[PDB]
Amino acid sequence: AHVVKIYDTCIGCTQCVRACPLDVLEMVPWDGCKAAQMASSPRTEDCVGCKRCETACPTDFLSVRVYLGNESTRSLGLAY
Amino acid sequence: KKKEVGPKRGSLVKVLRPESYWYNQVGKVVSVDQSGIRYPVVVRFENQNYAGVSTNNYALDEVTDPP
Amino acid sequence: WLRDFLWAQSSQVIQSYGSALSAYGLMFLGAHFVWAFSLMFLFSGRGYWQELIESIVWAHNKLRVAPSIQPRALSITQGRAVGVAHYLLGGIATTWSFFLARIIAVG
Amino acid sequence: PWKQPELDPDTPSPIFGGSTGGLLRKAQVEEFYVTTWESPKEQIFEMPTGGAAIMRKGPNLLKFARKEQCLALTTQLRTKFKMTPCFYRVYADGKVEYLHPKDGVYPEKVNAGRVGVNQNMRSIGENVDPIKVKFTGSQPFTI
Amino acid sequence: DVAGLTPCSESKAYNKLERKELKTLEKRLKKYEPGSAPYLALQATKERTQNRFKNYAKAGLLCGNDGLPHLISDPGLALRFNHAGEVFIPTFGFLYVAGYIGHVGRQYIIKSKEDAKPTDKEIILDVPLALQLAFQGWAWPLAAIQELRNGSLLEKDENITVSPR
Amino acid sequence: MKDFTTYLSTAPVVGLGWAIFTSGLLIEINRFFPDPLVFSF
Amino acid sequence: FVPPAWAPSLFVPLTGLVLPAIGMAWAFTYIQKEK
Amino acid sequence: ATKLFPKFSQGLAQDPSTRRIWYGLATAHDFESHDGMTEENLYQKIFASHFGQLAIIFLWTSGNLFHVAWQGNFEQWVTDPIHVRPIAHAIWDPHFGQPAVEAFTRGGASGPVNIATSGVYQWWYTIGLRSNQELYVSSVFLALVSAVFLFAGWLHLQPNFQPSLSWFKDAESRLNHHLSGLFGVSSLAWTGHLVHVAIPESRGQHVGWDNFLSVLPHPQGLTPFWSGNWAAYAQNPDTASHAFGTADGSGTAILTFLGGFHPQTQSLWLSDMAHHHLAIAVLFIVAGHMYRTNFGIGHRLEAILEAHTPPAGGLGAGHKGLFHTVNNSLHFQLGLALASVGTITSLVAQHMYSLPPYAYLAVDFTTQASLYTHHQYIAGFIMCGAFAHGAIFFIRDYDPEQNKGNVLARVLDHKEAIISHLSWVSLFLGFHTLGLYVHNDVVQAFGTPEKQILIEPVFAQWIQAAQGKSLYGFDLLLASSSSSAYSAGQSLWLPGWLEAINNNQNSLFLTIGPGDFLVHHAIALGLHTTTLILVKGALDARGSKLMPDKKDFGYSFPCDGPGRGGTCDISAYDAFYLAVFWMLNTIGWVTFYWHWKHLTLWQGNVSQFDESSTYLMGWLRDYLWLNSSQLINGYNPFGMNSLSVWAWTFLFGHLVYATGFMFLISWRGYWQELIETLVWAHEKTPLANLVYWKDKPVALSIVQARLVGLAHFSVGYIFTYAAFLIASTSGRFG
Numbered sequence A: 001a002h003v004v005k006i007y008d009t010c011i012g013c014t015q016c017v018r019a020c021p022l023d024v025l026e027m028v029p030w031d032g033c034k035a036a037q038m039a040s041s042p043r044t045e046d047c048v049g050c051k052r053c054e055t056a057c058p059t060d061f062l063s064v065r066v067y068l069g070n071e072s073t074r075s076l077g078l079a080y
Numbered sequence B: 001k002k003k004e005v006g007p008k009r010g011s012l013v014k015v016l017r018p019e020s021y022w023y024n025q026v027g028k029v030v031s032v033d034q035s036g037i038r039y040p041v042v043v044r045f046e047n048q049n050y051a052g053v054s055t056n057n058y059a060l061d062e063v064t065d066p067p
Numbered sequence C: 001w002l003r004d005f006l007w008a009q010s011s012q013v014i015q016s017y018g019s020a021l022s023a024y025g026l027m028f029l030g031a032h033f034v035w036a037f038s039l040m041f042l043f044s045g046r047g048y049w050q051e052l053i054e055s056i057v058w059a060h061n062k063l064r065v066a067p068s069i070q071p072r073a074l075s076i077t078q079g080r081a082v083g084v085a086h087y088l089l090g091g092i093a094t095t096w097s098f099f100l101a102r103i104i105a106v107g
Numbered sequence D: 001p002w003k004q005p006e007l008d009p010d011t012p013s014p015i016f017g018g019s020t021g022g023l024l025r026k027a028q029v030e031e032f033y034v035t036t037w038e039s040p041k042e043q044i045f046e047m048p049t050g051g052a053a054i055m056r057k058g059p060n061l062l063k064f065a066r067k068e069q070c071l072a073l074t075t076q077l078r079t080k081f082k083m084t085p086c087f088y089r090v091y092a093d094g095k096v097e098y099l100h101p102k103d104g105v106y107p108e109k110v111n112a113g114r115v116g117v118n119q120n121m122r123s124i125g126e127n128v129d130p131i132k133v134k135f136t137g138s139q140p141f142t143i
Numbered sequence E: 001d002v003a004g005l006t007p008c009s010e011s012k013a014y015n016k017l018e019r020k021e022l023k024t025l026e027k028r029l030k031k032y033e034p035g036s037a038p039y040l041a042l043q044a045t046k047e048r049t050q051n052r053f054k055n056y057a058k059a060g061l062l063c064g065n066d067g068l069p070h071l072i073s074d075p076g077l078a079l080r081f082n083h084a085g086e087v088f089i090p091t092f093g094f095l096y097v098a099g100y101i102g103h104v105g106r107q108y109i110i111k112s113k114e115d116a117k118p119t120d121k122e123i124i125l126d127v128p129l130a131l132q133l134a135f136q137g138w139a140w141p142l143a144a145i146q147e148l149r150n151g152s153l154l155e156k157d158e159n160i161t162v163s164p165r
Numbered sequence F: 001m002k003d004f005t006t007y008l009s010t011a012p013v014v015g016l017g018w019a020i021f022t023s024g025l026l027i028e029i030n031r032f033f034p035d036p037l038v039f040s041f
Numbered sequence G: 001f002v003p004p005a006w007a008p009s010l011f012v013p014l015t016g017l018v019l020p021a022i023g024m025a026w027a028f029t030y031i032q033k034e035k
Numbered sequence H: 001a002t003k004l005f006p007k008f009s010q011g012l013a014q015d016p017s018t019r020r021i022w023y024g025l026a027t028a029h030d031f032e033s034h035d036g037m038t039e040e041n042l043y044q045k046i047f048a049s050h051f052g053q054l055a056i057i058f059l060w061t062s063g064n065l066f067h068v069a070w071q072g073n074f075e076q077w078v079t080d081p082i083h084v085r086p087i088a089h090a091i092w093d094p095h096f097g098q099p100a101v102e103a104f105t106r107g108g109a110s111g112p113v114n115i116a117t118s119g120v121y122q123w124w125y126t127i128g129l130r131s132n133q134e135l136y137v138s139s140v141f142l143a144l145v146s147a148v149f150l151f152a153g154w155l156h157l158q159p160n161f162q163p164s165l166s167w168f169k170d171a172e173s174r175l176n177h178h179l180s181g182l183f184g185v186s187s188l189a190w191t192g193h194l195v196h197v198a199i200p201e202s203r204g205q206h207v208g209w210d211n212f213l214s215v216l217p218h219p220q221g222l223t224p225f226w227s228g229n230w231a232a233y234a235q236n237p238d239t240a241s242h243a244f245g246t247a248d249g250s251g252t253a254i255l256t257f258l259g260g261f262h263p264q265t266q267s268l269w270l271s272d273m274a275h276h277h278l279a280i281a282v283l284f285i286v287a288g289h290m291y292r293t294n295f296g297i298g299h300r301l302e303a304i305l306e307a308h309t310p311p312a313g314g315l316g317a318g319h320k321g322l323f324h325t326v327n328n329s330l331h332f333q334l335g336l337a338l339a340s341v342g343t344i345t346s347l348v349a350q351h352m353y354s355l356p357p358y359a360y361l362a363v364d365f366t367t368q369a370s371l372y373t374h375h376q377y378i379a380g381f382i383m384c385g386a387f388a389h390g391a392i393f394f395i396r397d398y399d400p401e402q403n404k405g406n407v408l409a410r411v412l413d414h415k416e417a418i419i420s421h422l423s424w425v426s427l428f429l430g431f432h433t434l435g436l437y438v439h440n441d442v443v444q445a446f447g448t449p450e451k452q453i454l455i456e457p458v459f460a461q462w463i464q465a466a467q468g469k470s471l472y473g474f475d476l477l478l479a480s481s482s483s484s485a486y487s488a489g490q491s492l493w494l495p496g497w498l499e500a501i502n503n504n505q506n507s508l509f510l511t512i513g514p515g516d517f518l519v520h521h522a523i524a525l526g527l528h529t530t531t532l533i534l535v536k537g538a539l540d541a542r543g544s545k546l547m548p549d550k551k552d553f554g555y556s557f558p559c560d561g562p563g564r565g566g567t568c569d570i571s572a573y574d575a576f577y578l579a580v581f582w583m584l585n586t587i588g589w590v591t592f593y594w595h596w597k598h599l600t601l602w603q604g605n606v607s608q609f610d611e612s613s614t615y616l617m618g619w620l621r622d623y624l625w626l627n628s629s630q631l632i633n634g635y636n637p638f639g640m641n642s643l644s645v646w647a648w649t650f651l652f653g654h655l656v657y658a659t660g661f662m663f664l665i666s667w668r669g670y671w672q673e674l675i676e677t678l679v680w681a682h683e684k685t686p687l688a689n690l691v692y693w694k695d696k697p698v699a700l701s702i703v704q705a706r707l708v709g710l711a712h713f714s715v716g717y718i719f720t721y722a723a724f725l726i727a728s729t730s731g732r733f734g
């Protein structure tokens, strides 16, 4: 499926997870940010690449990136 | 700890981050975190980016004086 | 329709120059222009024009004439609206000019 | 959460007529998703696959063909009535997989029990150029 | 007599075009009584056409094989054949006016930035300030080249917003 | 008055004023100098 | 050397009907070829 | 899942959708993105593909020769090259009706035939082919050559025959061999064939393989060549009253400098072209042994690249590091090759019509128009391909650490300045050209056309007066005998060239007026705008402010979503796909100008073009409406003339244009939802749900949609203009 990569510039604001319509991201404990939270993608096989997480990222550039490629039944959003 | 880990709050800074929207731009320091995070320098900018935000966190090595 | 309706007619529109119907021919040309100009908004997208605007921003920043209000490309919905509006206006005015010139000259 | 709940097919479905955007042949060929919640009272909600239904006072079970529909129903129930539902995925052979509350605390929380995966520890824009990774099968963002 | 072309006064197609225009104006005029407003309107149109055809002649304008006047754009060639007033003087005048516009816009951009919310001044114009800068732009090239001399016309590449490579 | 003046100070109103001013200037120039093409004093 | 007169009556239906039909048959079997 | 059709992509194999087919075709020959691909395997696949394309080209020209020989009138056209029209191929359509069969019988044929417009008849008459048996043996020999090339590609693909990586990367030896052998001795053999065959065949002497090694091309017999008296070859040139098919007014000359045209056939002299190709061969051979091979002499590419750096930091590091950049990145070489070849075919198009090299080619108006239009469209297409593959080079294989401070790093550093200046010049040209055209149209509409602005193109007229055209007057070179340019070559090529350039009948330096000036500025606007789009796509290919990480997303990706205001059409592929539209408009402009000017020249009403190209009503009415009367009357309820097929393919092109509008305007969400509804309809129906699809039907990708819309748009454009051009030039001429 698609590739979801999260960098260290994330501030743990949990906006990307709330904007996710397929429950791909998660919040794990961290020490590199003030909020002590870091975004993770343990369910990247269910991500369709809608880039809704990138819209909700408040940091400049993007702390979360979605790269398309190798579309599957789950990645193409097919009910059939 | 001694002095402060970053620049003086409220002072103008120039962002040296190349991938940032505010590269070679002047912003105002809001607060500098002292716990030891990667990007403690909170900078507020007068002009918003395409996402509409105006604040970002930068590290110590990507801020200089306004020339 | 191509020959006996569109080519058999519309000869009054193109021969209207030098007469009182020449404004219909000018409006016909302007309508063709607006219809063609709509296609750049109907096609393409936003990132291309955004980067072009970034280059123009660099050009105005070199001369220190960059506006305080940041210029941005039209939104995708806004670009679609501009494209459909100019497309409809061009087609409507084309048919209007052709119909009026043909029906006034020979009618 | 502490113990992963097991789905019950005998739980009553919410009061609804016939759906047209319901489960297709993929439900009997590939996996299909099933959402469960616990309604304290009867009320009318809007399904993402059609019109409106009425949930029963008790357990409620619904079936969908896409996980996005299940999460849309979940967030609608959480925003409108604070229901906290949970959906499973059932394959063709009957394998049941727990999907939304992986630690039972929802992904908005942390719970100090999830290991962060697929996290690049370098800043964005510090990735190598595609010329550096050529004829290797490794993307610049995958390192 | 440059580019194998004849002057408009010496040309025959120019006079033929003028005669045809006068003929069709007279044909339109003959359908109205002399004591009617369309008659005076068509007489004024004919007088304007005759004045324009007289002014296009005896002014250096030349036409080739169709009676439609042609314009020479190369300086020097236009200078030695009295064709500078065709495009050479108008292009200098347009450059003067365009520099006026650019200098006025630059002055308004610079002078409305050292204040709180410059976008508010951009969207709601300071009309007395705009008129003052409008009446102060008569010496735009002097101020432009002086700003070039002191270096305030151009910004250095360190304070300029730049796209990543 | 000053609120109405700031409304008149908005960009579309001053653009409209410039539009009428420039259009009227060019129209009066064309009317009192009928159809010129070449600068001949 | 010179082809016979019935060559347009044979090669044109062959490359207009038969050859595209067998090409589409081979392509359809190749698209849906599974392990 | 995991079907075997995309064997070059394991990820595409595990795609249960119809898109797997489509992405299995568009990514077919992109070997750099294939799984488990090495550089040596990529080079071997490239070599096999090149041999395949060569075999296809040779098979195609063999088929052209065979279909001209069989079901053609080559001998009848040889006898009378003025009246009877060439025949391309016979028509066997069972859907044809009897009036359609009767109407298509032209050129003295026994069946329905197509009038040839490719111009191979004139070319094969010029090179010396006269009989149908010669065309037959040439076609079968080219078919054998194509089969040999296909077998060679297969054998070089086979193991223990694949070339090494250093064999492909040996740039110096390849450059020397292709400069000296592919261009030098090839041109030497071609001009030897010219001297041996074409000049005797143009002088009524048959030279064949049977009588080869027996007939001497020059009566002196090669002894002036060894004696150094090369001027003896240019002793008795062909006279003005010389027949091309016969020996009347012939001569004994194989190499000369008789600049101009043959008066009988309005084409360049065969001896002049033979001398030209001999000089070209000598220049290529003497420059084909300059680079450093395994011998001790030669030139190293990297040494000259690194040494050519301006002092005092004019270009920074200079041209250093470009050798590895060219050698490692194949897309850079692809872009350079496509740009050079596009400039070459642009020059070919601009030099065929003014200087016809083939006998009886200028009289064939439809042939010249079709050849010019085809060459210009191919030129624009590979111009755009050069720029697109340059953007591909910038995205895929470009290491700034390698070429740091060089010319590439510098032009990537100030790319904003280049893009801004090109945008400014595009805005300037477009604003002033549209303002001038609208001003002229309004002035002509008001009944007083003398008020329009007609800026005389004095620069081109001054150039043409400096090159021999005395129509504009003036006293520059090649018009006054006191000039050194007139004195030099006064008895070499000037008397013929001046006669050719002072004639208004041919297309050699035609009269240029204010309408020509305006359309030339329109052409300049089109070229500068397409250049602006393509260099903005190439320079911002690997990154921009909206997408700094554009290199990680590849060359052809749809968008980044609606975030940051909207990011659709941000890849360099989208910039190329917009530049395809702009290139199509520009080539449409140049072909409209060429077609209207040449049609008014052939009709003799050059004044109509002079007074009608100023305003766009003249372009719409006197060109797009007046000349389309015979096209639209190809088929009607009254009957049918010979231009029925051209009217049908004209409407066909307008239809494909509309389908391009379909695939370009509407985007993916509506069609995806409609496909979902159709999937439900097929799933929930009796007597039809027994069947099923092996792959799930999905809507086409956004990049795929752009490509399909571009293809339909370009196909409709090409077919429409080809139909209009051929029907207008052939319906009233011959």
Ligand code: CLA
Binding pocket: H307, H308, H309, H310, H311, H313, H314, H315
């Ligand atoms: C007699 C004095 C003299 C002069 C006139 C020059 C001049 C030149 N030398 Mg040089 N040279 C000199 C002495 C001189 N040199 C000496 C003493 C040495 C030591 C032996 C050299 C060694 C040397 C080397 C080794 C090389 C040069 C090169 C060059 C050229 C490029 C210089 C440069 O940096 O680009 C000029 C500076 C720039 C910053 C370039 C800007 C270019 C702009 C951006 C392009 C604008 C294009 C624009 C769109 C055009 C619009 C027109 C429209 C119609 C399209 C230039 C023509 C180079 C060369 O051959 O190039 C031809 C080269 O490789 N020189």
Ligand code: CLA
Binding pocket: C033, C036, C037, C039, C040, C041, C043, C044, C052, H423, H424, H426, H427, H428, H429, H430, H431, H434, H525, H529, H532, H533, H578, H579, H581, H582
């Ligand atoms: C025939 C139709 C048409 C026209 C006129 C234009 C015009 C333009 N496009 Mg193009 N374009 C079109 C179709 C068209 N497009 C299509 C179908 C595509 C494929 C999708 C593109 C793809 C494309 C790209 C990729 C690019 C352009 C660019 C441009 C600009 C070129 C600069 C120029 O020539 O000076 C301007 C000339 C013009 C004719 C513009 C029209 C201005 C006139 C004078 C009217 C101005 C207003 C007037 C005073 C009336 C005011 C009142 C009114 C508003 C109510 C210009 C805005 C380039 C650009 O943005 O420039 C940097 C660019 O990068 N276009």
Ligand code: CLA
Binding pocket: C055, C056, C059, C060, C063, C065, E101, E102, E103, E104, E105, E106, E108, E125, E130, E133, E134, H420, H421, H423, H424, H427
């Ligand atoms: C007065 C302000 C101002 C100034 C000084 C400039 C200056 C420049 N622009 Mg910019 N531009 C402006 C406004 C301005 N622009 C506006 C409002 C727009 C949006 C329509 C643009 C759109 C634009 C584009 C798309 C491009 C430029 C380019 C350029 C450069 C070429 C010069 C030129 O005439 O380009 C031509 C400029 C125009 C046709 C824009 C004219 C817009 C209107 C007609 C003028 C507005 C005047 C303003 C109301 C005055 C305010 C005074 C105040 C007291 C009220 C130059 C750096 C080009 C470049 O990059 O060159 C390197 C280029 O490609 N500009």
Ligand code: CLA
Binding pocket: H025, H026, H027, H028, H029, H030, H031, H334, H338, H381, H382, H384, H385, H386, H388, H389, H392, H555, H556, H573, H576, H711, H715
């Ligand atoms: C010397 C010539 C040459 C060579 C060797 C290449 C080679 C390549 N190019 Mg390039 N290219 C060229 C010319 C060339 N191109 C030209 C002239 C253009 C401009 C049109 C382009 C534009 C271009 C783009 C924009 C892209 C490439 C890409 C590619 C790669 C994919 C090829 C492949 O295996 O897929 C095989 C591909 C296909 C089979 C698709 C072809 C479909 C065509 C358009 C259909 C034909 C149109 C029409 C329907 C025909 C019927 C007409 C109708 C009337 C009957 C490959 C490296 C791609 C790449 O590198 O991937 C990132 C890429 O993105 N090229």
Ligand code: CLA
Binding pocket: C002, C006, C007, H430, H433, H434, H437, H519, H522, H525, H584, H585, H586, H588, H589, H592, H616, H619, H620, H623, H624, H625, H628, H632, H653, H654, H657, H716, H717, H719, H720, H721, H722, H724
């Ligand atoms: C219902 C309306 C309609 C529509 C939408 C179309 C659509 C089309 N026609 Mg058709 N047409 C129609 C009715 C229509 N037709 C009718 C009724 C007739 C009469 C029989 C024609 C006669 C006709 C001809 C003769 C031709 C077309 C062509 C075309 C294509 C447009 C090519 C294009 O986009 O280039 C964009 C447009 C241009 C490049 C030039 C536009 C024409 C201008 C006026 C010429 C002057 C340009 C010149 C350089 C100066 C301008 C410079 C600028 C800076 C101002 C497209 C398939 C052409 C074609 O197939 O492709 C070339 C073609 O040759 N049509």
Ligand SMILES: CC1=C(C/C=C(\C)CCC[C@H](C)CCC[C@H](C)CCCC(C)C)C(=O)c2ccccc2C1=O
Binding pocket: C040, C041, C042, C043, C044, C045, C046, C049, C072, C073, C074, C075, C076, C078, C079, C080
């Ligand atoms: C061209 C283009 C742009 C760029 C267009 C922009 C930025 C809008 C420009 C509007 C101008 C500023 C309107 C005013 C123009 C003149 C300056 C006003 C008239 C001047 C005369 C009176 C002198 C998009 O943003 C876009 C977005 C989505 C889909 C397609 C497109 C698209 O095609």
Ligand code: SF4
Binding pocket: A006, A009, A010, A011, A012, A013, A014, A015, A016, A017, A038, A039, A053, A056, A057, A058, A059, A063, A064
């Ligand atoms: S939206 Fe961005 S900053 Fe916020 S938690 Fe997600 S990756 Fe981090």
Ligand code: SF4
Binding pocket: C045, C046, C076, H558, H559, H560, H561, H562, H566, H567, H568, H569, H667, H702
């Ligand atoms: S290409 Fe489509 S999905 Fe992408 S930004 Fe544009 S409209 Fe949105």
